[PDB]
Every structure is written in C-alpha cells, then in structure tokens.
Design a protein around this nucleic acid. Structure first.
Ligand code: MG
Ligand code: MG
Ligand code: MG
Ligand code: MG
Ligand code: MG
Ligand code: MG
Lengths: 196, 115
RNA sequence: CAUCUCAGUAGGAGCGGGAAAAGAAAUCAAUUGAGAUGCCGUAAGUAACGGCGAGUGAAACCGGCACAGUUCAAACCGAA
RNA sequence: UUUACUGCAGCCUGUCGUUGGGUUGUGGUUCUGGAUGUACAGUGUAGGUAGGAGGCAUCGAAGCGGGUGCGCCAGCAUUCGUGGAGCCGUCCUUGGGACACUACCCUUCCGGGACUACGACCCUAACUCUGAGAAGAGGACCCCGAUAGGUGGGCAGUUUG
C-alpha cells in the first residue's frame, strides 16, 4: 500500500487505548484539565479528522479545544404541582448532545467567527474534550476561498446556534433519510417538536 | 536507542543539504511517508519537537518495517532549512542521494551499529 | 384520577433573514420499478399507539406548484 | 396530617467509567519429562479404541541401591554403575479391558510458565485538600457521571363512594 500519513493518524485514533495515544492521553489530560473552558490551539490534535471535516492551513481558520462536563441535563426538581410524570428529573438527560454544547460554547467565545465542525479528542470521568473548527468569514483569505466563501452568506451566521453543523443535524434527526424521518425533516420545529 | 551523537546528526544534515543541491528530497510528512512506503527512501530525517506527536509517530516503526534508515533531528526549524524551505519540516526523505550517496550509506551503517 | 390527554401547547433561553429551515439517497419500493429538497392535494381518522378507555395519529405510492445541481477529505503531483 | 394510593428529591449501598504500577492468596487459561492404566498374576504395565497380528538388540535387552517417570521395595524405561537374552502369541496367563519399538488430543503431571474475575497489602504518577510557591497531607480511595436495589409526608398529585 501507499497510504498518506493522515491514514496513520486515523489508525492511531481508531482504538486509542490500544495505541500510543493512551500515554499521550495520560499526559495531555493533566494540561487540558489545567486549562479553562475554550482554549485556542495552534494545530489540531488529530490533523486527519480536522482536514476531513474542512480544516485548512490558512488564515481565518481557527481551531479551539472546548471542555464540557459529563452526564445529562442538570435539572432542578420542580417546587410546584406536577403529575408524577413531570416530577422526576434525575434520569432526564437532555436533547442537546455534549458535542453540540461544546460547539455552542466555542461559538460564544468567538462572536466574529462561524463554527464549521468539531470532533472528539478526549474524555475522562468528569469532562469531554472537543476541538471545534471556526472560520473567519470576514478575512480576505476566506473570502477568496471558493470552497469556504459560502460561509460569508447571510444565512451562514449563527450556524451552531441553529443546529446547522453536522452534530446539530445529527441532533435534529436529519442524519438519515427515509423511515424514521417523518417528524424530523425539514425541521424539528416544523412538526411541533414531535420528532426527537 | 542511545542519543545519536551530534557529529552523526550534523553529518545527516550535511547529507540533506548535499542531496538538496544534487539529488532528490521529499520534504514533508506526507511525501516522506509515501517515499518510505514505496521503498524509495534512502534516509529519513525526523524532527523531535512535534506537537502533536501523532504527526511523526508512525515514521519510526514504518521505516523499521520497510528497512529505511532514519535519524531524529533536534527540531524542525533547521530541518526545514536544510531542505531549503522557508517553513518548518517534520520529516524529509532522501530518495536520491546524488553526491551524498557515500555519506548517506556511512550514516546508514552508523545508525545500524548504534541501534 | 395516576398512564394518557391538555401538549411539545402556554411560557422561557439562544440564533437569525427577507425569507428561514430542508436538499442532491448508506432513500423509497417490491417480485422486474422510481430517482435531491420544500410546499399543496390525497392516502386517512387508515396503519400504528392507547387504564386497547377517553383519546392520539403517520408515511409511501399517486396528482400538482416549482425544478438544479454540486463542492470538499484521500489516492497522484508537491509550493506549481 | 399519616403505618391511605402513587410517585419524586435527599440519603445508604452494589456495579460500570474515571483508574494506574507492584506484591502475594484464590479458577483454569495453556502444555513440557512420563501414557503414568494393575479383579484374576503376569513369559509382559490393555505401549489409550487398533490394518486381530508381527519390530527392535553388545553399533543395547533384565532380575539391584531411597528403586529419577511410577508402582504390591515386583517390572516396563538402559540410566550413576555392574549383572552376561526382553520377543510377537495360530499352547491369547479359557478376556469388566487380553496386549506389535507404529505422530499419546483424553481421569495424571505440581516449571504450571503466560492473560485473566474476587480479595488483602504496598507504591505514586493520575486525582483530591492546604499553601503565592518550594512543598505538606491523602491517593487509585474519595468526589463526580451512569445504572441497580433500598430508605424516604422532606416534597406533591390525587383519592378517601
Ligand atoms: Mg463560559
Ligand atoms: Mg438556506
Ligand atoms: Mg444541508
Ligand atoms: Mg401528540
Ligand atoms: Mg401530601
Ligand atoms: Mg389535576
């Protein structure tokens, strides 16, 4: 075979606990725990994942690592009347996935940019880590790029907040076609949120 | 592996410069990986200051599987410079030794011994 | 009356344009076919769910409106 | 309001994840040196069921020492030695099985080496607390996410014809 080195990065991250990525994980999680909520990094940790998701080594493209807590929707017990079906909240996880939470926090930290995509990069018993790719639609390098200048359109602003990323569309039930997508496409809101 | 003495690494850099003058070099991790896989890599130079380490983690075992001599340069700035490049370079491969074939084979023998 | 219903309604938070979302099948079919998405009609109060109670409740096929297709990641080249 | 019905928080506890490294104690994982297998008597230990008979040997076959596998201080294995002929059975030692040196996987044999689930101990290196820090104290516990059971008028949905 003649495989690119991106293929080797992909293979190393396929079963990370069985490769050298486990030791890198042990050393990296200390640094990542020391960091805050939204950290900018020079290069993606997993270059192949970022490149397949649309990352390019050019000006106006920013990669950030976001830290999100684990578990479901941390919910308060109601203090007024409920019918025993709406009283219980401990087992109620949300409908917003952890990856989309990370994407939206990254978007909040960078008001002038747009979230492109994100990928999983680690987790421990208390946190998950995602690296979020963001694009600067007002940078001339991005404006010239004909594979990215769609992000300069008026409908591309607030992508992550309106569920238009890959994770958002997965969360909206539009990751597939056909049966099961009766109440999901073209939108969750279009069917009175009965899908999902 | 013992730390390769500075004279051997400097000879590797000199061979890289010489092959840049005359022979053919594959600068960059994708090109160096392709050259190793195709069996054209006479000598593989690998930088040691790579973040993340996934970029050049496969070069060592791959070159040991394909029987390609390899050496670790201290960092990627002068590795990119030795390949006549304005950027850093995480790895270069000499696919045509040119005027450094004798010194490339000397480096290969020295690496084989020091292993 | 507790599942159910009221109803994903009321209300809340965020984003956001003249529209938005969806959108070019890892689809729907059935013995052999069609060929992105949206919207309308119909299927149909049917299938399905349900103290199988009260109630809730599709889609495809089919007829229309309008029609539109493509761009990356990688292989090969290596700053072109 | 409560030992009404039905739930939900809080709390208790198991399991999984976070979560690593060593030491032993528990099961077989996996297999080398022996096929170690034997009512009755044996020239002889079914050399696993067997081409129901047919190979080796002074260039090796024994009656002996605590008898190296084993065992009824017999006898197969040639071994530290010295003694100077073990057969195969159509005279089957009238068979629980009756027997040729012919790739033994199989109730043994304890180097059980190697991964493994439970438990006990230790280590620090994650992680936690203190400190501005050097560091100190804990430590794979606790916290935390998830799941399983309990307790639960703390709460809250009703019912109480
Ligand atoms: Mg914040
Ligand atoms: Mg649009
Ligand atoms: Mg789309
Ligand atoms: Mg409904
Ligand atoms: Mg009460
Ligand atoms: Mg009521």
């Amino acid at each position: 075979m003649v495989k690119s080195f991106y293929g080797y990065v992909r293979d190393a991250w396929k079963n990370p606990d069985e490769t050298y990525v486990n030791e890198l994980r042990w050393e990296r999680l200390q640094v990542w725990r020391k960091q805050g909520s939204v950290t900018r990094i020079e290069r993606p940790t997993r270059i192949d994942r970022a490149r397949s998701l649309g990352y390019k080594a050019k000006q106006g493209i920013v990669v950030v690592r976001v830290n999100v807590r684990r578990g479901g929707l941390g919910h308060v017990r109601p203090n007024r009347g409920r019918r025993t079906q709406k009283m219980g909240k401990n087992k109620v996880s949300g409908g917003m996935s952890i990856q989309r939470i990370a994407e939206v926090r990254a978007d909040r930290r960078y008001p002038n940019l747009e979230v492109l995509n994100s990928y999983w990069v680690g987790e421990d018993g208390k946190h998950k880590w995602f690296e979020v790719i963001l694009v600067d639609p007002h940078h001339p390098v991005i404006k010239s790029d004909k594979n990215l200048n769609w992000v300069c359109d008026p409908s591309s602003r607030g992508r992550a907040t309106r569920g238009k990323t890959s994770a958002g569309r997965k969360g909206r039930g539009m990751a597939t076609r056909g049966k099961g997508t009766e109440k999901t496409r073209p939108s969750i809101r279009a069917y009175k949120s009965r899908g999902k | 592996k013992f730390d390769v003495p500075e004279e051997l690494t400097n000879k590797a850099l000199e061979a890289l410069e010489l092959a840049r003058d005359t022979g053919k070099i594959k600068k960059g991790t994708n090109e160096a990986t392709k050259a190793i896989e195709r069996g054209n890599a006479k000598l593989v130079l690998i930088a040691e200051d790579i973040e993340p380490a996934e970029i050049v983690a496969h070069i060592g075992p791959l070159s040991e599987e394909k029987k390609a001599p390899y050496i670790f340069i201290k960092n990627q700035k002068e590795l990119g410079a030795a390949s006549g490049l304005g950027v850093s370079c995480a790895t270069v491969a000499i696919v045509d030794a040119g005027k450094a074939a004798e010194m490339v084979q000397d480096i290969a023998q020295k690496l084989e011994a020091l292993k």
